[PDB]
Amino acid sequence: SIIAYTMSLGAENSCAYSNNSIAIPTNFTISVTTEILPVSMTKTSVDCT
């Protein structure tokens, strides 16, 4: 059925702000993402007459 709902804005998350506590990475992941952009559009011409 069609359901109505309030949208979620994002995942709930958290961090511990804390003085003298720091996180440091121990490993990494390489990822590749794709970005798409248009450059041109069909060139057309209309004869008025």
Partner: protein
């Protein structure tokens, strides 16, 4: 409804034209869609929502005017509350002539939540949350990194931590007062609103024009004339009204393009100055950029840019190199 105010005869005459109304509807629908997209691109950059920490002492740094006020009906920071109060029956008259306004997809509360999440993210983990997971960093160390980023050793920060926190806290208080007293501070957002209102008022106003017709009112044309004479008079009014709507839409499209450019810029600034640190000159404030904090506003975004400016200076002798042995 704008053109043919519940007149069957007008509608049938309107149908002698091509798909005019369809094109106008497509243009306005397209604009409305873009307006929600712009909002999402500017604010919903981070989909992880962090809570504002309960510890209101970031190594001497305040931020209470920036962070949301938990005691209010709308969880706006003191600064945001001011911005909303400063930027500001005709709506019925417009409604009755077929001119309406659609709600935004995101509400002000939703925007405030995105803004708060970004602020919580930045205060807790600096820029790390914007490029991977959020890594907590003691606030003064986030500042140390930001100092190294502008060519000043971190030694300066630690030695002067109290001074820096005090100058910072004073600067924030000054902004809220500046916005409160300056009547033109939010003129850019007010101008957008004013232009849209004027464009709609113009459409309502032109309904009264005759355009060569005996009268502006279809009901009077129909109550006094026979069919073929009325058709001539009605067609004169239709032509005029079609032109009025077409003019409106063309301008509305041009204004929408301008706004997309503004929104794209705003999105860029957030990505580069809020979720990072920028080396671009005058991109995010005059002076050296350290960090930024977004605030929401009606129809837009307000950024607080924290920068450094060199102060007292002295005249010294210099030389390219030292000759030793």
């Amino acid at each position: 409804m704008y053109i043919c105010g519940d007149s069957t005869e007008c509608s049938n005459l309107l149908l002698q034209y091509g798909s005019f109304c369809t094109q106008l509807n497509r243009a306005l629908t397209g604009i409305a869609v873009e307006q929600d997209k712009n909002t999402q691109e500017v604010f919903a950059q981070v989909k992880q929502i962090y809570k504002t920490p309960p510890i209101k002492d970031f190594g001497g740094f305040n931020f209470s005017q920036i962070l949301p006020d938990p005691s209010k009906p709308s969880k706006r920071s003191p600064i945001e509350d001011l911005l909303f109060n400063k930027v500001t029956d005709l709506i019925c008259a417009q409604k009755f002539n077929g001119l309406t306004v659609l709600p935004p997809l995101l509400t002000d509360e939703m925007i405030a939540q995105y803004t708060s999440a970004l602020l919580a993210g930045t205060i807790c983990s600096g820029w790390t949350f914007g490029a991977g997971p959020a890594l907590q960093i003691p606030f003064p160390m986030q500042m140390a990194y930001r100092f190294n980023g502008i060519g000043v050793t971190q030694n300066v920060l630690y030695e002067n931590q109290k001074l820096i926190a005090n100058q910072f806290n004073s600067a924030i208080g000054k902004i809220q007062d500046s916005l409160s007293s300056t009547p033109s501070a939010l003129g850019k957002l007010q101008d957008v609103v004013n232009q849209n209102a004027q464009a709609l008022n113009t459409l309502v106003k032109q309904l009264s024009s005759n355009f060569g017709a005996i009268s502006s009112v279809l009901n009077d044309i129909l109550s006094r004339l026979d069919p073929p004479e009325a058709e001539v008079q009605i067609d004169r009014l239709i032509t005029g009204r079609l032109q009025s709507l077409q003019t409106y839409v063309t301008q509305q499209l041009i204004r929408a393009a301008e706004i997309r450019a503004s929104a794209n810029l705003a999105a860029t600034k957030m990505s580069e100055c809020v979720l990072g640190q920028s080396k671009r000159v005058d991109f995010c404030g005059k002076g050296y950029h350290l960090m930024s904090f977004p605030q929401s506003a009606p129809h837009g975004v307000v950024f607080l840019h924290v920068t450094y400016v060199p102060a007292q200076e002295k005249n010294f002798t210099t030389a390219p190199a030292i000759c030793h042995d």
